[PDB]
Amino acid sequence: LPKNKHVFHSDQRLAPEIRDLYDCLYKLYAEESASEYFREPVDALRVGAWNYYSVITEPMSLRTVLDYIVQGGRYSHVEQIMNDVELIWKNCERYNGAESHLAADARRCRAILEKHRERLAD
């Protein structure tokens, strides 16, 4: 699992739509407290979530997405990024149940991201 925190680097070589999504995602990652459990990939075995990797076949976190964006070679379209971001929330509801407060914060993050994007669209 990657060390320390993702360093904000808004790369000018990216498509503008992707750089914009990057900026919104970084804000969610670094600035919104409801994103806490979705920031970094979980060491499932270390935290005693023993069956996590069998329940969740495609793990995902904001860190993972942000690093992919900066590293290149994965994303060519915003819809691809959003596909991975949606995984974060879906994985959460799948493993913790829709009634958990973790799932409540996933849904909050999802809605907040939507608003970040709509705002920058003006």
Q: How far apart are CA 89 and CA 100, in angstroms?
A: 12
- Long-range CB pairs of 81-85 (<8 Å, 24+ gap) are 81/18, 81/21, 81/25, 82/21, 84/60, 85/25, 85/60, 85/113
**For the CA atoms of the chain, what is the radius of gyration?**
14
- Classify domain 1-122 at the CATH superfamily level: Bromodomain-like (1.20.920.10)
56 Cβ contact partners less than 8 Å away, ≥ 6 residues apart: 91, 94, 95
Domain segments of the chain as ranges: 1-122
Structure obtained using:
X-ray
- Please tell me whether residue 72 adopts helix, strand or coil conformation: coil
Which two tokens mark 38? 């979705």
DSSP state letter for 32: -
